[PDB]
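Board work, copied verbatim: Leucine--tRNA ligase
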Amino acid sequence: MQEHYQPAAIEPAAQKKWDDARISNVSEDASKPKYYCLSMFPYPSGKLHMGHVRNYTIGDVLSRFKLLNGFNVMQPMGWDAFGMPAENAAMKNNVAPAAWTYDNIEYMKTQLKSLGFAVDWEREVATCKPEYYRWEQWLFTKLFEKGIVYRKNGTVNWDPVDQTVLANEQVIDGRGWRSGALIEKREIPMYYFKITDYAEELLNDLDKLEHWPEQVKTMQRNWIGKSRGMTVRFAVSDDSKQGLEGDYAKFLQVYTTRPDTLMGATYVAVAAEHPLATAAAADKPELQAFIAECKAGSVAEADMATMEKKGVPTGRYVVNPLNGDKLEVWIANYVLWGYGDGAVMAVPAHDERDFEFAAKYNLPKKQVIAVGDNAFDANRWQEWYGDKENGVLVNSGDLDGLDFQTAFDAVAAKLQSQGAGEPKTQYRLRDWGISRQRYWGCPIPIVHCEKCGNVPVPADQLPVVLPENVVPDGMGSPLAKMPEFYETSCPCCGGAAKRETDTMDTFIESSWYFFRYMSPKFSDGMVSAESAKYWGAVDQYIGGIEHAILHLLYARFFTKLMRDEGLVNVDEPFERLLTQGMVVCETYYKDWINPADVELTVSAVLKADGLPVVISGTEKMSKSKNNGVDPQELINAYGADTARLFMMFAAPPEQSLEWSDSGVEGAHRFLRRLWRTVYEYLKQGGAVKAFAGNQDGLSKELKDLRHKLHSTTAKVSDDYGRRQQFNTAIAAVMELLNQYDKTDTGSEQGRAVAQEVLEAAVRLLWPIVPHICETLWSELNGAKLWEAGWPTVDEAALVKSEIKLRGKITVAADASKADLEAAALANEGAVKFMEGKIIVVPGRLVNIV
Ligand SMILES: CC(C)C[C@H](N)C(=O)O
Ligand SMILES: [Mg+2]
Ligand SMILES: [Zn+2]
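↓ predict structure ↓
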């Protein structure tokens, strides 16, 4: 054994031992219980960043822990390789996006192998390869046949200068980004997943996920936005039919989730495109201007709640079918023409938005809900104005006194009798548009034929191959200009036809890749049933909260689609879910300087020029402030184990991790100490059989150390398995070593206990720093570490020794105050001096007066 810790020595050899042993290359082995630990696979955008290293070390700790508990553990990796990164690099460097990701793949793959993650590289996928995306094309056509995917016209943001479609985030103040020209909204045919059909199943199944963090389930429910409310029809007043045609001359229909407050509607509001809006806007020019100002506007959800609510009166009127009030119809910029009806009611007394609107315009407010003896101020919104649970109706005539749900059922009753109303479920969830006017993406398997329409490619012809020898210019979609690509035959009639040229939302790959890992070379379908039956569902998923909504929702949706196709039998893909916290680092600068390029003394200056540089604040490692710390700088300088140890110890996984030079140093020093402990131990005796069995007759000191050992093993087992707090687990192992350091392990029995401590410590840290632990282990013991398995808790080591003057009794050391006092009134010498308060002094006397 060398005296000095050399990570650059032992880390490649350990990996080679693990590789040669093929401990991570696993099959569908019924001779072992399966465990599927999955980390969110990366975009091959170039190199790894500290976020990758944190995410994948967390998954590897969990994987290795289950491995040492004998599970058949699959920890797969692969490349989410479609998207804009490559397309952008293709413009920047005149290289094909394929060639640019593959170069990133083989680099990041050796970068990951370098870190020693216990990963089944035989299960590696790359989503940008035909043998992968052919299967999402296949499912696309299957669902397109059933109408679960359909074609309809949707609006997009067209930049008439950059000449492509822009995302609703890449538009700034109504204009483009790299062009900044006035966006043209254009109606183009597009493909959708009918995810609304699965809304209720996606909502209700969340309850099955007892091991998901509730916030993620909460975020998923709010995005689906189920509501149980009422459709309500308002008779258009006789004087207000001027210009109204058809069923819009008859009634204004709105949706509401507070029909219990229908007696409080003081006006109504219609979208800019509403027939009543435009029928009023004929002879009134200022309404036509308002309608145009609304049309020329963003529709971003974030822009909507942070928007000055604006309305205009119309002079048209409708009648509330409950109390006969005459209510003016306003046009308002918060009403959207597409979400159910194009119009809402407004109850300012019990809806804050309606309250601020009515306070701006001096519109009336009618309190119809009261909450106990709560005073009500018409010029002061308070939280209880919107109480759906602790309210009963007031100023509502024959509806006074009912709670929400009783008044709900009564208003439904009253409205249905008149026919003017019916209950209705609604969801904010829209359908999932998957078409992208982009090159580097899965081609959409549809061929357009003038005779046969939009026909899907037969399963025999799949894949529709994306040509890789392309360098997109950003001035269009190169597929739509490649006749050698889009020109084809019709599969139904054999005549001239053109392929679809849009590609798919790259969320499509990440929506089913966890199943493909079960059989990534299977050629007869998405996933062989043999592997799907064995692996079932992902036992543990690890990723960032940036995917808690859309990616998880799409992954769950694809699971239930794939189930309903009979490809899998699970309903939900991820049982356990762990959200990694982000990694932050200080920034340095008008001109942001990578920290490794900086000499930071109290002060801080450049690394080259040596001139004073500005030490700015601390934030997520990014490119916007050039504070990403390349983990390759970390591995070269301290080894992989120091890197993994630093991030697992710096903070709990869910919490943000602050980069720290002294932190990495400490991690490396602790590994240096762990190395020296074993070396010093073997220098004065060499290996011996670890202590085991009855510990009676061990000295008090060695007994305590065995107590500290097996209590540590229980707490590290708990921190790995249930709490998933790896920082406290590492702390506990440091506490054991500290007590060991203070324990005279010189005797024969002392060396046996010392051997027990060390053999447990290296196995307890192996999930975090396996390179040094694998090395130290084989220097302590000749068996395979993975075959010796996770250390067991010796519960005997946890039982600590037991503790007129009438007599003396023996009680336990962890006894109760009633435990000692109970034996006092049953002692022989006690009853002899008692003849039919009890001052119990723990550790001395228990006198009974
Ligand atoms: C699960 C995937 C959506 C993860 C994604 N490829 C990422 O690197 O963030
Ligand atoms: Mg269950
Ligand atoms: Zn045809």
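Residues 449, 451-452, 490, 492-493, 495, 497 surround zinc ion (ligand 3) (CB under 6 Å).
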